[PDB]
UniProtKB/Swiss-Prot annotation:
Interacts with 100S ribosomes in stationary phase; alters the relative position of the 30S and 50S subunits. This is Ribosome hibernation promotion factor. Required for dimerization of active 70S ribosomes into 100S ribosomes in stationary phase; 100S ribosomes are translationally inactive and sometimes present during exponential growth. Able to dimerize E.coli 70S ribosomes in vitro. The chain holds residues 63 to 102 of 185 of the full protein. The N-terminus (residues 1-126) is homologous to YaiA and HPF of E.coli and can associate with ribosomes, while the C-terminus (residues 126-185) seems to be a functional paralog of E.coli RMF. Belongs to the HPF/YfiA ribosome-associated protein family. Long HPF subfamily. It comes from the Bacteria. Disulfide bonds: none annotated.
Amino acid sequence: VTLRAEDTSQDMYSSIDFVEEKLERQIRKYKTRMNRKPRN
RNA sequence: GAGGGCGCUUCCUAAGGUAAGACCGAUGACUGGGGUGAAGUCGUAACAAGGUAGCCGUAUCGGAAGGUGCGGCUGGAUCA
């Protein structure tokens, strides 16, 4: 898979914070999108 | 002689002490919860049949979201 992340906050430190946490929650979205190649 | 102040004790008796509380405030080592703020860190849950739909009352096991089970209802689905 390929997935980029050009996102924002007010602070660049807060963009590193909330956007890399957004990468964590993206992999949380990518659990069944990765692991569950069976949906049944 | 009567009566009279004083003569003359007591009654109630103001205050002070006692004891055994109760009330109410202040106060307090450490400590339980809650709210606020970071943007640490743990996590996939709750949201779509939101990734095991849940949601209750209840018992019980988790660091924690939570789980297991008793029974009930859609404020639930593909449509059963």
